[PDB]
Amino acid sequence: KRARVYHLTQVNKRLFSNIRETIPKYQHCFVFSVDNMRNNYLKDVRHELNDCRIFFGKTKLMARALGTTPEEEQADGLHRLTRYLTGTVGLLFTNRDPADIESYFSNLSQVDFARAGTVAPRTVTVPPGIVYSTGGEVPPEHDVPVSHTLEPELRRLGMPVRMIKGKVCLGEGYTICKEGEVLDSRQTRLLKLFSICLSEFKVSLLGYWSSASGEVTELEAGKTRPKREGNR
């Protein structure tokens, strides 16, 4: 019979240390917030910014790596940068000019199918009459009628569509979702069926610390964002 520590020791045979190793090597550390971060997108950002180091882990861990107080900070003034570390954020260490970083992320975007829980960025309404395969997302002349395969599926999901002259038809139109509404599983299913991508990957720079000054430069997105409250 063995003590738990024996068990733990045999099993015992990362982010915090990597961040601390990285701090001395870069002119700037940015905090960024992200919408619709996906593994592939992070890999692509890392590859394109191959001269930068990007961290995206537990926020509490990243904050402690940097140091949240003047006593614990790993570089002069760095504790003030930790004030941004709330919600879905990451760190970006770089020797690039801040305008270059701003330029890169202002143009960076990609779209995906929204998942349940996401807030709809816009209202989506399928127009009356013949139902097209993207439900009006694409102009009709560029689209094709929706497959009759989907007609009972569409009805199961709440759309009052009918069969008219061999084509799926509405009859006002049908609103799948309204702007600012939280999407549920039924709605995200309907959106995916029409190939409508309501989810957009987007990075916002909140602010950055600079080694040259030991000061934090606050950017617009960082101004109205809630700040970190110390845990201890």
Burial 75-96 (b: 16+ CB within 10 A, else e): beebbbbbbbbbeebbbbbbeb
Residues 6+ apart with CB under 8 A from 95: 26, 27, 28, 51, 52
Q: Is 179 helix (H, G, I), strand (E, B) or coil?
A: coil
Provide the resolution (angstroms): 1.8
Nearest-CA neighbor of 19 among 71, 100, 75? 75
Using the structure block, give the residue that is written with the tokens 């919600």. 87
Q: Is 62 helix (H, G, I), strand (E, B) or coil?
A: helix
C-beta of residue 28 within 8 angstroms of C-beta of residue 193: no
End-to-end CA distance of the chain: 38
The backbone torsions φ and ψ at residue 179, rounded to the nearest 5 degrees and listed phi first, read: -50, 130
- Any idea which architecture 113-198 has in CATH? Alpha-Beta Complex (3.90)
C-beta of residue 36 within 8 angstroms of C-beta of residue 202: yes
Q: Where are the domains of the chain?
A: 15-112+199-232, 113-198
C-beta of residue 187 within 8 angstroms of C-beta of residue 202: no
C-beta of residue 197 within 8 angstroms of C-beta of residue 14: no
- DSSP string of 105-168? HHH--EEEPPPTTPBPSS-EEEPSEEPBTTTTSS-GGGS-BPPGGGHHHHHHTT--EEEETTEE
Residues 6+ apart with CB under 8 A from 8: none
Nearest-CA neighbor of 157 among 129, 131, 122, 121? 131
* Cα separations in angstroms, 230 against 39, 59, 92, 120: 29, 12, 22, 32
Residues composing the chain: 232
Using the structure block, give the residue that is written with the tokens 């992320």. 105
Which 3-state string (H, E, C) describes 3-53?
A: CHHHHHHHHCCCHHHHHHHHHHHCCEEEEEEEECCCHHHHHHHHHHCCCCE
C-beta of residue 161 within 8 angstroms of C-beta of residue 170: yes
- In this structure, what token pair is assigned to residue 120? 């709809």
Nearest-CA neighbor of 138 among 199, 198, 195, 200? 195
The maximal CA–CA distance of the chain, rounded, in angstroms, is 77
The backbone torsions φ and ψ at residue 89, rounded to the nearest 5 degrees and listed phi first, read: -130, 165
Q: Superfamily assignment of 15-112+199-232 in CATH?
A: Ribosomal protein L10, N-terminal RNA-binding domain (3.30.70.1730)
Residues 6+ apart with CB under 8 A from 170: 126, 127, 128, 129, 131, 159, 160, 161, 162
- In this structure, what token pair is assigned to residue 16? 């915090």
Experimental method reported for this structure: X-ray
Nearest-CA neighbor of 139 among 151, 127, 154, 147? 127
Nearest-CA neighbor of 209 among 37, 125, 84? 84
Using the structure block, give the residue that is written with the tokens 């609103």. 175
Burial 130-159 (b: 16+ CB within 10 A, else e): ebbbbbbbeeeeebeebeeebbeebeebeb
User: What single DSSP character describes residue 86?
Assistant: -
Which residues partner with 83 through β-bridges? Answer: none
